[PDB]
Amino acid sequence: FPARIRNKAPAMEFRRPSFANTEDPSAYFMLQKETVPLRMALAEKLLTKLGRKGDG
Amino acid sequence: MLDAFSRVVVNSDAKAAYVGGSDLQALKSFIADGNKRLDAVNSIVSNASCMVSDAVSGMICENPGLISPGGNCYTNRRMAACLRDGEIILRYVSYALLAGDASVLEDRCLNGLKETYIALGVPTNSSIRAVSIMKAQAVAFITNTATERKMSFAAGDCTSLASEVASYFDRVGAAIS
Amino acid sequence: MLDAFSRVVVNSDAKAAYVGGSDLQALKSFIADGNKRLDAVNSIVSNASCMVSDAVSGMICENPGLISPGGNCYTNRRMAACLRDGEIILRYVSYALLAGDASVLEDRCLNGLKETYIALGVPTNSSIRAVSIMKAQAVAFITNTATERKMSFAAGDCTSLASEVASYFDRVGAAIS
Amino acid sequence: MLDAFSRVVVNSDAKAAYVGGSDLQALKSFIADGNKRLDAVNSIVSNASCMVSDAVSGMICENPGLISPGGNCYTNRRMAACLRDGEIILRYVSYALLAGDASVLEDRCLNGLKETYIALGVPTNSSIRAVSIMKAQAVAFITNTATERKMSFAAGDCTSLASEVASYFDRVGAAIS
Amino acid sequence: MKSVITTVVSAADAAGRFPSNSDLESIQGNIQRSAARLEAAEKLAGNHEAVVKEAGDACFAKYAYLKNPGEAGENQEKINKCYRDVDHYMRLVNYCLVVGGTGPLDEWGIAGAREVYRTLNLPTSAYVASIAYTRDRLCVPRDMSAQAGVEFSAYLDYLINALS
Amino acid sequence: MKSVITTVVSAADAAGRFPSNSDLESIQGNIQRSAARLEAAEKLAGNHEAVVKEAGDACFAKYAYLKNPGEAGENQEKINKCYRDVDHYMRLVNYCLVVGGTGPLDEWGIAGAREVYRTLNLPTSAYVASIAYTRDRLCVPRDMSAQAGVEFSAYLDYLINALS
Amino acid sequence: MKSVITTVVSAADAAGRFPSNSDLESIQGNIQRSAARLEAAEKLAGNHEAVVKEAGDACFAKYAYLKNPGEAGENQEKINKCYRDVDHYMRLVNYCLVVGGTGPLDEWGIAGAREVYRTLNLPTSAYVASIAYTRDRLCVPRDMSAQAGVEFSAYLDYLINALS
Amino acid sequence: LTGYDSKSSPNFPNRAATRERRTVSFNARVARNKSQAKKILEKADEFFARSVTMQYKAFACPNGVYDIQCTEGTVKGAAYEKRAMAVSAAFRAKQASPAAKARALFENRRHAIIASHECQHEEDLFVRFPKLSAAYMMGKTEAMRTCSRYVVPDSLEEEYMAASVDRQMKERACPGGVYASSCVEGNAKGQAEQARVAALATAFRSAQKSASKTTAERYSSAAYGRDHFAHGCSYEESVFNTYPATAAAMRSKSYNY
Ligand SMILES: C=CC1=C(C)[C@@H](Cc2[nH]c(/C=C3N=C(/C=C4\NC(=O)[C@H](C)[C@H]4CC)C(C)=C\3CCC(=O)O)c(CCC(=O)O)c2C)NC1=O
Ligand SMILES: C=CC1=C(C)[C@@H](Cc2[nH]c(/C=C3N=C(/C=C4\NC(=O)[C@H](C)[C@H]4CC)C(C)=C\3CCC(=O)O)c(CCC(=O)O)c2C)NC1=O
Ligand SMILES: C=CC1=C(C)[C@@H](Cc2[nH]c(/C=C3N=C(/C=C4\NC(=O)[C@H](C)[C@H]4CC)C(C)=C\3CCC(=O)O)c(CCC(=O)O)c2C)NC1=O
Ligand SMILES: C=CC1=C(C)[C@@H](Cc2[nH]c(/C=C3N=C(/C=C4\NC(=O)[C@H](C)[C@H]4CC)C(C)=C\3CCC(=O)O)c(CCC(=O)O)c2C)NC1=O
Ligand SMILES: C=CC1=C(C)[C@@H](Cc2[nH]c(/C=C3N=C(/C=C4\NC(=O)[C@H](C)[C@H]4CC)C(C)=C\3CCC(=O)O)c(CCC(=O)O)c2C)NC1=O
Ligand SMILES: C=CC1=C(C)[C@@H](Cc2[nH]c(/C=C3N=C(/C=C4\NC(=O)[C@H](C)[C@H]4CC)C(C)=C\3CCC(=O)O)c(CCC(=O)O)c2C)NC1=O
Ligand SMILES: C=CC1=C(C)[C@@H](Cc2[nH]c(/C=C3N=C(/C=C4\NC(=O)[C@H](C)[C@H]4CC)C(C)=C\3CCC(=O)O)c(CCC(=O)O)c2C)NC1=O
Ligand SMILES: C=CC1=C(C)[C@@H](Cc2[nH]c(/C=C3N=C(/C=C4\NC(=O)[C@H](C)[C@H]4CC)C(C)=C\3CCC(=O)O)c(CCC(=O)O)c2C)NC1=O
Ligand SMILES: C=CC1=C(C)[C@@H](Cc2[nH]c(/C=C3N=C(/C=C4\NC(=O)[C@H](C)[C@H]4CC)C(C)=C\3CCC(=O)O)c(CCC(=O)O)c2C)NC1=O
Ligand SMILES: C=CC1=C(C)[C@@H](Cc2[nH]c(/C=C3N=C(/C=C4\NC(=O)[C@H](C)[C@H]4CC)C(C)=C\3CCC(=O)O)c(CCC(=O)O)c2C)NC1=O
Ligand SMILES: C=CC1=C(C)[C@@H](Cc2[nH]c(/C=C3N=C(/C=C4\NC(=O)[C@H](C)[C@H]4CC)C(C)=C\3CCC(=O)O)c(CCC(=O)O)c2C)NC1=O
Ligand SMILES: C=CC1=C(C)[C@@H](Cc2[nH]c(/C=C3N=C(/C=C4\NC(=O)[C@H](C)[C@H]4CC)C(C)=C\3CCC(=O)O)c(CCC(=O)O)c2C)NC1=O
Numbered sequence A: 001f002p003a004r005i006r007n008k009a010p011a012m013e014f015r016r017p018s019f020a021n022t023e024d025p026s027a028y029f030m031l032q033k034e035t036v037p038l039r040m041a042l043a044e045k046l047l048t049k050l051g052r053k054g055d056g
Numbered sequence B, C, D: 001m002l003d004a005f006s007r008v009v010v011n012s013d014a015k016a017a018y019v020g021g022s023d024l025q026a027l028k029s030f031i032a033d034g035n036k037r038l039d040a041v042n043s044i045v046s047n048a049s050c051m052v053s054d055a056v057s058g059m060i061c062e063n064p065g066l067i068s069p070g071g072n073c074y075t076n077r078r079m080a081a082c083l084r085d086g087e088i089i090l091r092y093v094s095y096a097l098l099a100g101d102a103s104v105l106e107d108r109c110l111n112g113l114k115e116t117y118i119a120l121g122v123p124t125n126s127s128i129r130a131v132s133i134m135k136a137q138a139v140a141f142i143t144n145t146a147t148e149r150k151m152s153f154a155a156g157d158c159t160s161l162a163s164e165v166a167s168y169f170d171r172v173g174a175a176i177s
Numbered sequence E, F, G: 001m002k003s004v005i006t007t008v009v010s011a012a013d014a015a016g017r018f019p020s021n022s023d024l025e026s027i028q029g030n031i032q033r034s035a036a037r038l039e040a041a042e043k044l045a046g047n048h049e050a051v052v053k054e055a056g057d058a059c060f061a062k063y064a065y066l067k068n069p070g071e072a073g074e075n076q077e078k079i080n081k082c083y084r085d086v087d088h089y090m091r092l093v094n095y096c097l098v099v100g101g102t103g104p105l106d107e108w109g110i111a112g113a114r115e116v117y118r119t120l121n122l123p124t125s126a127y128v129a130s131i132a133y134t135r136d137r138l139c140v141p142r143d144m145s146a147q148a149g150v151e152f153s154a155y156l157d158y159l160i161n162a163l164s
Numbered sequence H: 001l002t003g004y005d006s007k008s009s010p011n012f013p014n015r016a017a018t019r020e021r022r023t024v025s026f027n028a029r030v031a032r033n034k035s036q037a038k039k040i041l042e043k044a045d046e047f048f049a050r051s052v053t054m055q056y057k058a059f060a061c062p063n064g065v066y067d068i069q070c071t072e073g074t075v076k077g078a079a080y081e082k083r084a085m086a087v088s089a090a091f092r093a094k095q096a097s098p099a100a101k102a103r104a105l106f107e108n109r110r111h112a113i114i115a116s117h118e119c120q121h122e123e124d125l126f127v128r129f130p131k132l133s134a135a136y137m138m139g140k141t142e143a144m145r146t147c148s149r150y151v152v153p154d155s156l157e158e159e160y161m162a163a164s165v166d167r168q169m170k171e172r173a174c175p176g177g178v179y180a181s182s183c184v185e186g187n188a189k190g191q192a193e194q195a196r197v198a199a200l201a202t203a204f205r206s207a208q209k210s211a212s213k214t215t216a217e218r219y220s221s222a223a224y225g226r227d228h229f230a231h232g233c234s235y236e237e238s239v240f241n242t243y244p245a246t247a248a249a250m251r252s253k254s255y256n257y
């Protein structure tokens, strides 16, 4: 895994049509590639709710 | 246009492409049972942030030695790098559901994960135990047999796609086995 | 020099006989994937910037003593002339691919490299480690299984194309042994 | 040097503009007649040794003084140098026919040729009749009107290049006299 | 101009010979390829202003540090020059499709572009990040044929492996 | 020996680079002619032992001054070796239809032919008779197709334009 | 290599004459800087171990985006390589200011430098932030006399006028 | 429009009669206003002939130090005779035959276009300026050591492969059994042997190159003869690819040698 391709991932969004069997122009779908971040914020509330200090 | 979809991921720099109201009919004519398929992959990415939280915590709940000092879920930046990686499989196996094939899952994500994890000190038997939670979590969302939340779909069967994603998580499991 | 069209005419000059409907069928199938051969050098010229680049880093990350004090590629007078040593063997192999034979390669450049390399003191032992870094990335771009850059081709089988480029690089080690 | 495709963008480079469907249709008809264009230069190269040997005695049949003592065309060498002079200015107009532009003969053969003929005493009243003789033979080959040679061509008109071949001949004598 | 027509007449001129029929095979390959190459250029002549604006927005998205002072994007007049510097490439990519060869690219835009970019402190890492965004999000059945999406996209990565 | 695609790679290292995008446009064009020309090689292949003796005594029907002594054409085994000298000119003109270009022609049919035909006093006008004796009877819809019928003669008159 | 001695000893041989008395005047000028330049060599040789840090930290303050993931400094081990990188350039100014010329730099430091930086994507404008920081740091009262301040500061300005 | 009319200028060339005039007045009226640009483009190409002969000596003097390639002297004053022999023969080659005048021009406008590897700006200069193309060849063919003085043999057979081609290359020197003035040793009473005494010094020390200087010159000479003589002659390329001194002693110009 190189330095450029590391924690890179697709990301996709879904807006379905509004009513069944009718064509909807608002329905749209992303397929944007996006680097997944480190996410330190919920890392703190998951380690503290389960075990001990985590301060090595 | 799946080959043009595959070039958004494989081209080693981030682009963007999106599908309007005209070419959504191009996708339904292309992919078989795509109204069952796009309902399925929407029901994984909408609840993936809860899905990564129960996956790492059940690994703690049946093996609490990871959060011990000297463990691999100690020193919380190291615990955050599990939570980074835990959706990276679910970002890519959702993409394996979208393309209908796990070729792009293999070389970009699974290739080299076995030798990386023994280089860093990852316990591999907990790593199959983390992904087997996410194998059981996706089929409760595709079949909508999840206990806590439920989603809204048009009625029918989706057990072929539930078996199709079950043939994708063991590719993650046997790569790091 | 001479092509795969002329490779049966290599034999036909010493036949006291001709080439007709006895050997055109071996050349008829070369046309049936003549689109494929022109489609499988379009991947090789598509990544010319990286193939000589990651090759010479592929030996640094394994044998790093070559840039140590007492090295063959010590200063920038040497290693900038090492990237010219490693690029022109990517040049005379792509001429050999469109010809179907090593008649361009084995006489224009590789005709006796063991009086220009042992006359300099070039390390032959990690030159062949600098060969299979490019061979393993040549067969990886023939197939569309490169984990970074996907390429949009027409579907089909190219194992005869992937085995041929490995059988060009093999005699490079023979030309330095 | 500067062929027909290069010509249509070098007068459009000073426009600082793109090349869209205003003049590409004039170039799309150039590649339409390209099959007839290869069916025109084939009729010139196929009969080279006759038509260069033709005019060297067809010049002196009108002017017998050129074979007289004290003649420019008097000895064996000055004729042997004349015949090898003879197909150079016809192999270059074949280059202009095959490339669609007159920008290969007027920089490599008409590049100061009236400069050198004055330095040797080569006559010019004979050198323009010796190419006008070799001009009518070039429109009697692209239009199949030769009386001792017939090239089997499909049904169609060849006044498209009849004035255009002679356009690559009248510029010759004008800029060498 | 390095076109296929010039390369087969320059070897014909150097040998002192006539146009032989071996070169005539290569001219036959043009009129087969010319229809699947000109409409890559005809669609580029009607889309150039919308593609050159959408290219440079990923130049500043991948490297947003150029807006700092001392860099090459601190004021508006040279960010305007950045779009002009990249429009000149995607005009010469249009020019080389019509010729068929790589003639206008390696002579006008490329030859001499190395020793002026490091001279004026311009990185080529942001130059290749402008066209690689252009070369990627372009669906080969949606805009043009399956052949022009191969041939034209083979011209855009010719810049990247000559600049890197 | 110069054919369609060994020439354009002989010029591709003459500048010191890779294949271009127009370098592949040349290799498509012989593929457009690797069916219309390989039928013309097959017509010579299964008929060559009929045409060696057909056009062989054709030239002997021209020149009566070889039939008396004072020449190298006195006895029988010279005329047997003359029919050998026919077979070499059909061996390599069959070769050029396989590779597309004038490769095998210029080497051992065109270059060096002046010395061993003029110091050896075997006249080149006697050779061009039997060369044209094959060329003046191409039955275009009978022996081959219409496109093989025009390019088979285009290789026949190459020794015409060179040797005479 | 370039020095006062080896430059002027060349034209004696390359013109084929003896050692002159003008080249004897040239080594006399090397004596006037022998006790004037070599004090800076022993200065920095006992001083690099703290200025390899503060001039290695000097460029990343200007360019914090090198430590960003993806580019040439996206590894704590790349920056371990990056500090070793800058300890080769002024490792040669200890070799250049001991000889009297730019010999250890024009043959070991700049020769091939722009070609291993384009291919391996190392931005040359960060070396302009690396050792020219020491040019803006140099104190002629405190550190060393104004003879090093005219000669050590000169050899640095040779390099920025070479890596640009 | 500018005025009441627009007549042509009297400074335009070819404006007077030149029909029944004297010889003095004929030549004055054909070269009326053409003398300026003839002398503009005469100092133009002479500066081009002075400029590329400088740009190839920069390889001969890398980073401000002279190599073993310059070496114009070996003994006391061994360049004074080399000074005369290089500049007296330059006048001898300016009184050549009128057949060799354009033979020099059209062949210099042949090989330079080959060596200028497809750069359209560069071939446009070589067609207008014949002095530039005479200087482009001998500068580059001496920058890359390819002509006669540096491609020494390494085998024992290659001394006759040299000797086979060169005395057959000197068919270009002798027209018949006479010699020519283009191949003259010298014209002083010692200048014959004074050309020899330098001719062995320049061959000897040029056989003392480095390992890089011989291994990079043994492939540059091979591709040189592979795109100047053997354009398709694969038999001649079969000796040009493995035996580079064969591919180097043969000279691309009609040098009358
Ligand atoms: C582009 C594709 C891509 C992937 C496929 C993933 C894969 C991946 N994971 C980690 C890196 C890591 N992955 C883990 C995860 C774990 N360790 C454990 O013991 C648990 C079992 C598990 C959490 C559930 C940890 C802890 C690290 C950091 C290692 C360390 O800091 O020592 C790295 C770090 C090396 C690098 O940056 O190259 C990569 C590539 N990330 C990506 O960017
Ligand atoms: C671009 C966004 C986009 C989507 C997300 C889907 C959403 C979607 N699915 C269906 C329609 C359907 N969706 C499902 C799927 C399911 N039903 C189940 O019982 C399973 C639990 C679940 C599969 C996991 C089925 C079975 C149908 C009906 C058959 C079909 O049309 O495929 C319909 C048609 C509804 C109607 O007739 O009005 C729509 C809009 N389609 C889209 O265009
Ligand atoms: C301390 C001990 C501890 C555990 C043992 C686990 C508990 C746990 N839950 C699930 C199982 C699951 N987990 C989810 C995930 C979710 N459900 C939702 O509705 C949300 C959107 C999302 C985050 C809460 C789903 C959908 C299932 C399957 C159905 C279910 O059991 O609820 C599984 C996998 C199936 C199996 O048991 O094999 C496990 C191991 N979590 C813990 O903390
Ligand atoms: C036409 C045929 C032809 C070739 C096959 C190559 C072969 C070749 N390599 C070098 C020369 C060299 N080649 C290398 C390359 C390497 N040394 C190593 O330790 C590594 C194994 C490898 C880089 C990965 C180096 C370091 C030099 C010496 C550079 C110098 O002379 O300063 C030389 C002498 C100088 C030169 O021409 O570059 C030649 C002929 N070059 C050619 O012209
Ligand atoms: C002038 C420039 C020029 C090119 C760039 C190539 C471009 C090219 N590639 C293919 C066409 C093809 N290319 C491939 C090759 C592959 N497909 C895969 O999935 C594998 C990854 C890879 C094998 C290595 C295949 C399988 C075909 C279809 C033709 C065939 O199957 O023989 C075709 C034929 C399509 C058609 O004619 O309509 C063309 C023109 N040819 C040219 O003339
Ligand atoms: C008194 C001296 C004298 C001659 C020696 C001949 C020579 C000759 N032939 C042609 C004219 C020509 N010459 C040829 C050439 C050839 N024809 C063929 O069929 C062969 C393929 C090829 C010889 C190998 C052709 C095709 C023409 C035009 C048709 C014709 O008039 O014959 C012309 C041009 C007439 C003009 O000026 O318009 C001349 C001078 N005619 C003369 O008046
Ligand atoms: C590699 C070598 C090579 C060639 C020599 C040509 C050979 C050639 N010529 C034509 C085809 C043709 N050639 C002519 C030309 C003429 N008809 C006349 O009446 C005039 C005498 C003469 C004008 C110069 C015409 C009119 C056609 C028909 C096609 C068209 O009109 O566009 C065709 C198409 C017909 C077919 O497919 O069978 C071909 C293959 N093409 C090649 O690829
Ligand atoms: C001549 C050269 C040329 C190209 C290479 C393409 C490139 C290109 N694409 C788009 C425009 C677009 N490009 C895409 C991307 C895609 N579209 C899809 O259907 C897939 C999801 C994905 C390709 C696989 C989308 C979705 C749009 C429309 C903008 C949007 O809705 O977001 C635009 C702007 C035009 C507009 O306003 O829409 C351009 C220049 N177009 C050209 O004219
Ligand atoms: C014929 C083809 C042709 C080209 C390729 C360009 C090449 C080019 N660019 C610039 C000049 C420039 N080019 C850029 C462009 C950029 N800098 C960035 O921040 C980005 C990396 C990139 C835009 C995406 C900038 C900012 C300048 C101004 C630099 C300066 O003048 O100091 C100049 C100097 C003269 C001038 O400013 O006009 C030249 C010759 N110009 C041409 O005429
Ligand atoms: C030892 C190296 C060597 C060379 C590089 C060439 C160089 C060369 N070519 C020719 C002379 C020639 N050289 C060729 C060239 C060729 N002839 C063919 O049949 C081939 C296709 C092609 C490559 C062999 C031709 C056609 C001539 C005759 C035309 C002329 O005299 O210029 C001559 C003078 C005549 C003679 O050979 O006596 C010389 C020195 N010859 C050599 O002996
Ligand atoms: C590979 C090249 C090749 C050829 C070109 C032919 C050439 C050829 N044709 C004939 C044989 C013949 N050739 C003709 C001539 C013709 N027939 C017609 O329909 C037309 C009017 C005219 C063609 C212009 C006829 C009529 C015969 C048979 C009867 C005869 O004349 O003897 C023969 C004698 C052997 C036989 O009986 O067939 C030969 C060698 N054969 C070959 O192997
Ligand atoms: C019979 C034909 C005929 C001509 C074509 C002109 C040619 C011509 N032009 C000028 C002279 C000139 N011609 C131009 C014209 C131009 N410079 C430019 O920048 C533009 C490219 C272009 C017009 C748009 C200019 C600017 C002068 C300069 C006058 C001066 O030097 O003061 C002169 C010298 C002044 C003179 O003699 O009066 C001559 C002879 N005269 C003629 O008799």
Ligand SMILES: C=CC1=C(C)[C@@H](Cc2[nH]c(/C=C3N=C(/C=C4\NC(=O)[C@H](C)[C@H]4CC)C(C)=C\3CCC(=O)O)c(CCC(=O)O)c2C)NC1=O
Pocket: E106, E107, E108, E111, E112, H048, H051, H052, H055, H056, H058, H117, H118, H119, H120, H121, H122, H125, H132
């Ligand atoms: C007096 C007139 C005059 C010229 C015509 C040029 C001709 C020329 N160009 C270069 C040198 C060069 N010339 C070019 C130009 C080109 N190479 C390419 O790849 C492009 C296709 C083409 C531009 C269109 C390049 C890129 C170099 C540097 C690389 C080299 O040395 O070959 C050199 C050698 C420089 C040196 O020795 O240091 C010379 C003499 N120079 C002149 O002084």
Ligand SMILES: CCC1=C(C)[C@@H](CC2=N/C(=C\c3[nH]c(C[C@@H]4NC(=O)C(C)=C4CC)c(C)c3CCC(=O)O)C(CCC(=O)O)=C2C)NC1=O
Pocket: G011, G014, G015, G017, H057, H060, H061, H066, H069, H070, H071, H072, H077, H079, H080, H082, H083, H084, H086, H087
């Ligand atoms: C046209 C007939 C002709 C010549 C050739 C020269 C030959 C020549 N070179 C000289 C002398 C000389 N030669 C060189 C080197 C050489 N010179 C260069 O310009 C470059 C680039 C060189 C290496 C290739 C140097 C460096 C000198 C010393 C003069 C100097 O440059 O300071 C000297 C003086 C020797 C002496 O002092 O006794 C002569 C006569 N003179 C002529 O009349």
